[PDB]
DNA sequence: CAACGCATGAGCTAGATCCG
C-alpha cells in the first residue's frame, strides 16, 4: 500500500509524555509536530516507545528543550519526506538546544520539498558534516548549523555510502556509525530509487519496493487517491492540502462540523477550482447550498454564526466570535457596559452584519447612545418568538437616544411586538418615527409602550421643534430655529443640542456630514402633565476648503534621465480630490563648490507642469544626468470651476549620472622644456556629470615607483594642463584621469615622451 | 451732572418692558446690575431715550443674550464712572454671548480703576473696533478683546464726521447719534471731552468743565473738597481711589442710602471690612467677629446668582447666607468642580443650596461646618435645597460634624441614581424638614435605583516584591451571597507618584476564591527598580434591583527591586597618541539604581612573528566611578589593545555589574620611525661587488615587510632590490652581484606597515670594473 | 520544606508560586 495507516492531526506536547500515546495508529500528521518544555524526565523511558508507522509530515517538525534523548532514531524510524507546507520561523526542521542527543539518527530523509534545516546549541551531536544536504535539501542556501559539538573536530566522525565528492574532498557521508547516507545513481533526481539503482515510478519518491510501479512505492509527489496518485486527479474529487483529492461529500461535512462556532481554528471550507480551499479569496463570496464561490459583484459580505441561538455581547471580546457574521440564524442580545476606546471597535466587529433572524434584546445597555452600528442590518423577521409575543425588547437604556435614521436607512419587520420601557433618553416622537418605516401600523397590532416611561431627562412627548434658518461655512454653522413656548413660558428652562458626525456651534470639519436636532426641557406641574419638543433628525454636511500639502514626497532615480516619485495624499482632502499637479525645476550646480581644493580633506558634499490624476506616483523623463531637480507637488481637489488647491510640497531629485561621460578624450599631449619641466595637456570631457573637480596624472618609468600628482581645477584652469616639475629624462608611462563628482573614469594610454639614450 | 438724582440700591432687569425706565431717576447705584436671558420680549418693544441721570455705579455690569436691543443709550447715555468693590469674572465689565445689537451707548465711559476688560464670545456684535481700548482704560495689552467677531472688524461702523473729536473702524464712536470723546492716548485713563486732550489734566473719565480739577467727576488721586491731592489728609479717608471723606462723612455716605456701606480702615473709607468682621448697625462700622463670620457680603433682594467660575462674591468670607443662590455657570463638563471654584472657603451655608452634574466626587466633605439654615429670606418655592444630576455622588455627610438643622426650607431628592436611599432618609431626619410637616416632594422612582453605597475595602493578605515582579494576595472575600461573586478586578499601574488617580491602570481579573483560598495576583514582567500602585475591587453579580455587594481594596505602592546593570552604552576605545589609548562609553540603558563604578579591564595585544617574515619580493584593570571615560597609557607605537568594559550599580555586598564589552584598538603608528638608521658602510671592489650594510629601523613599527634598496646610476636605468627578512638577516644588509661602471648611489627605506618611512640619504659608492 | 536548577525573561512556545 502507499499509506495504509491513519490520518493524524497536528498536536503540541509540553511538560509530559502522556499525550504522545495518541500516535499508536495514525501515520500521516497534517499540520506540524511541536514537542517542547519537558524537564523532569529520565533518559531511560525513551528506549521502549516507538512509532514505526509515521511517514508524512506536512508543515514542520520542532524539537525544543528535550531532556533524556540521546538518539531519536529509536522514535522516528520510518519518516521520509517533509513537505514543508508551512514554514515555522522560516524553517522546516529545527533541532535546538538538545542536551543529551549523542547522534541525530535521521537516516531516512530523501527530499525536503521546501524550507531548510537548522541545528543549534547542541554540544552532543557528531557526524553533522556527513549529511550531504544538497542531495536532500533542494535549498542549501538557507541551511544554518552552527554552535554544535562539531564546532571543533573532536567527536570522532568515523563510519563505514560512496563517500560523495560534492565538495573538493572525498568526504564520507554517514548518518550514524552503523548507517551511511544512501546515494544511488542520479539518472532520476527525485523519482524514487532502489538499492540496486533501478529508478522506480516517476511520480513517487523516497524508498521503494518494486520499480516503475505507482501502486507499490512509498511516497509520491502531487496528490494521492486510494492507493494510486496522479499529478492531477479527475474531478469527482477536489484537491485538498496540495497532497490529496477527495469527493465533495467529505469536506462539505467539515464546513458543517464547525458551522457551530465551537472552534475558531477551523475554516468554513469552500469549493473553488477543485480545491476545497478554506476561503475563496477577495472578490468572491459564498452561496447557500452549492458551496461554490460567487464572483462577488461589487462589495459583498462574509459569514460566521451565533452561539446556541442566544449570543450575549458584554464587550468587544464577546463580539469577537461575531466577527464577520453576516446572517445570524437565531436571536441576539447586547449588554455593553463600557471599557476603553469604544469609538469604532463596536462598528468594526459588526459593521457588516446583514440579517438577524430571532429577537433582539437591548436589556441593561448603557454604554451606547445609538444603535447606528447595524449599518448593514436590513430586516428582523424573527422565526422564533420571544415569550409574550415580542420581537423587540429594550429596558434600562439611560443614555440611548437615537435608534435608527429613517432617512438614510429602511427597516422592515413582519411579526412580533415591541417593548420600549424605562428608556428616558429615548424619546417618544422617535419611537413614533419607526412605525412608518418598520410598518407595525400595518397588520395593525396593539403594542405596549408606556407614554410616561420615556421622555425623562428630556421633554419631547408633545411638540416637534422646527428649524428656521441654516447657513454653513468651512468651519462653523449657526442654528436658529423657531421658538417653542409651553403654555406656561416660565416652565421652559432651556434647550439642549446634540450633534455627531440661536446658537453658534464652532467645532466642525470640512467635508463632513453631521446629524443635528433640538430638544426642549420643561419642568413638571403638580399633576404629572409634562410638555416639550424634539426637532427632527436633520443632516448637516460641510463644504470643501483647499486640502493640505502632499505628505512625505520621495523621488528616486533609476536611469540617467529618469526620476520616479512617491508621496502621500494630504491629511485633509476636504472633498473629492480630482487630481494632482506636479512642478519640477532644475538646480544646475552649487557655484560655491567651484573654489575648494578637493585633494586636501575629501568631498564637500516658467517651469514645466504635469497633471497626474488619481495616482500617487510620477515617472519623470527627458532629464539631464546628475542634475539636482526641485519638485513641487500640488494636490488639487476641484478643477473645472476655477481650480484651487493647497501649498506646494517641496522635494528634490537627482538623476543617476552616466559613467562614460568622464573619460579624457584623446591622447594627452606632452611638451618637453629644456629645464626638466614638462607640459601635459588634455581636454576636459565634453559632458561632465555635475563637475570634473580633480585630475589624476600618473607618470611612471617602467620598473620604478610611481608618484601621484593632484592637478587641481584651478591649476588646470589657470595654466591649461599641468606643469609637471621634477622629471628626470627618459621615457615614461603616464596615465591621465579626470575625477568628477560621480567617480573615476578610465586611464588614458601611457603618455610616452621619450628621448633616445 | 453733579449727582442730580437720588442714590438707589442694586437692581436687575428681566423679562419685561415696563421696567426699562427706572434709572432715569437714580444717579448713584450701590449694588449689582445685570441684564440677561431676554426672551419674552421682542425687538420692536424696546424704546430709545437719552437722560443725563446716571454718573456712577459701584459694582460690576453684565450682559448675556439680550434679544431685541438696538442701542445702549436707552438706559446708559450718561454713565461716566464705573468701578466696583465686588468683582465678577475678575472684570469690571463682562460682555458674553450677546446678539442682535449693532451699536453701543458708552461714549462717555473712560474711567476704569478696578478690574479689567473682557471682550470675549460676542456674536453679531458691532462697534468693537471703533473703540480705542487705550482711550477707555489702560492700553489693549491688559484687556482680552478676543474670541469675538470684531477681532476682524466686522459690521460697517459709521462714526459722525466721516460731534466726533479727532482720533470697520472709521473713527472712535459708540452710537450713530453720539461720538466717543477721543484724545491722545497719553491720557490713557484720565478721560476727556471732545477737545483732543486730557479733559482737564489729571481727571478720570470725564470732567464737566475742562481745565478745572474741581469739576473732575473722578480723578486719579483722591478728591478732597475741590482738590485731587495725592493722599487724603485727616480726618478725610480714601474713598475708592477717587475721593477723600471724613469718618463722619464716611458714616454719613452710607447712612444716606439707608446699599453699600463704607467704614474707616487703612485710611480707606471704602465699602469693605477686614476678614471675619461682622457688622454693628450703630454707625455701620466694622466690628470684630469670631468663628464662621459672614462679615461684609451683599445679599440684597434676598437672592444672588452664580454663573461664573471666579468672582468676588463667595470668597470674601460670607459664611452665613441670608439670601438665595442659583448656579448657572456656562461652559465646562463638571459643575461639581465649577461649584467648588466659588464656595471653596465657605463651609457653612445658611441659604439656598443645590448641586448639579455630580462628578469627580462621591461624597461631600466641603460642608462640614454647616449646622443651621436660617431661611429668613423665602427661597424659590420655599425650597432651600435641590438635588438633581447626582450621577457620581455615593455618600453624604456624617452626623457628628455636620449636624445641619433647617429652620426654613424644604427638601428635593430627585435624579439621584447612584446614591442609596439610606443617606436620603438621614437627610430628612437631621435637617428635620419631614419633622416640621413641611411639604417635601420626593421622587423615589428615579432615586434609589442604579444605586451603590457599599464601599467595603479589601486588604492584600500576602504580598511579595521581587526584582521584576510582585506577587500580591488579598483575603478571600465573600459577599452576602456566595453565588454573588464574579471574582475580583485588581487595578494596578506603575506610580512612583504618591498622588495618582484611577479615573484616567491595567486591570487583571481573579477567579472567586475556593468555596478556602486567598485570591491574589502576581504581575507578569515589569521594569526592575520601579514603583507600582496596586488595588483590587470585587466584581459581583448585580440583581434587577441593582444592589451592590462588592468590595474595593485600597491602592498599595509596592516596588520591584533592582537587578544587574545594563552594558555601558556605546563603548568606544580610540587612540589618542602613539603611547596612549582612551576608552569612552555612555551610562547604561538600564542603570538599575545608583551607579557605584564602571568595571573596566584592559590588556596588551602583540604582533605575531610570521607577519614580519612575510615578504612580497592579574589583568590590568581600572575602576571608573560614575564616569563615561577611560584613559590608559604606557602603550607602544602601532600596538593593539583590548579593553574590557562593564557598568556596575552595587559593589559593597556583591559584585553586581553589567556583562562585559571589549574594544580592540591600536595606537597610532610612527611613520618616521621606519626611516633607515645606522651607518651605511660600503665595501667597494673592482669586480662589481659592493657589500651593503644598513641597520634595522629605529622602531619595530609592527610587521616589517621588506627593505627597499634602490641602487641607481645617473644615465642608466634604475634597479631596485627587494631585501627580504632572510636576505637582510643573512647578508647583514645586501651585496651587489654584478654591476656597471660609474659612481652609483643607493637610497634605503625599510618597508613596514606602520605608515611608510622616508628614503634615507643616497649613499654613494663608486663602482669600477 | 521552605534562589536555582534540569530555560529564557516579552525576539509561530509558556510568561516568573510559569516549575520543583
Author numbering:
A (entry chain B): 1 to 160, 169 to 509, 550 to 653, 756 to 907
B (entry chain A): 1 to 162, 168 to 172, 177 to 267, 274 to 519, 529 to 539, 546 to 647, 756 to 907
Paper text:
The α-subunit mediates ligand binding via a leucine-rich repeat (L1), a fibronectin type III domain (FnIII-1) and an α-helical C-terminal domain (αCT). To understand the basis of this aptamer-induced full phosphorylation, we determined the structure of the IR bound to an A62 dimer linked by eight thymine nucleotides (A62D-8T) using cryo-electron microscopy (cryo-EM).
The third class of particles displayed more pronounced conformational differences from the IRarrowhead structure compared with the IRpseudo-arrowhead structure. In this conformation, the L1 domain of protomer A is shifted upward, positioned almost perpendicular to the stalk, while the L1′ domain of protomer B is shifted downward, closely aligned with the stalk. However, the orientation of the FnIII-1 domain in the IRpseudo-gamma conformation differs from that in the IRpseudo-arrowhead and IRarrowhead structures. A structural comparison of protomers A and B, aligned by their stalk regions, reveals that the head of protomer A is tilted upward by 30° compared with that of protomer B, as measured by the angles formed by Q177–L459–V604 (L1–L2–FnIII2); 58° versus 27°, respectively. Although the activation state of IRpseudo-gamma remains unclear, its structural similarity to IRgamma and the proximity of the membrane-proximal ends of the FnIII stalks suggest that IRpseudo-gamma could contribute to full activation of the IR.
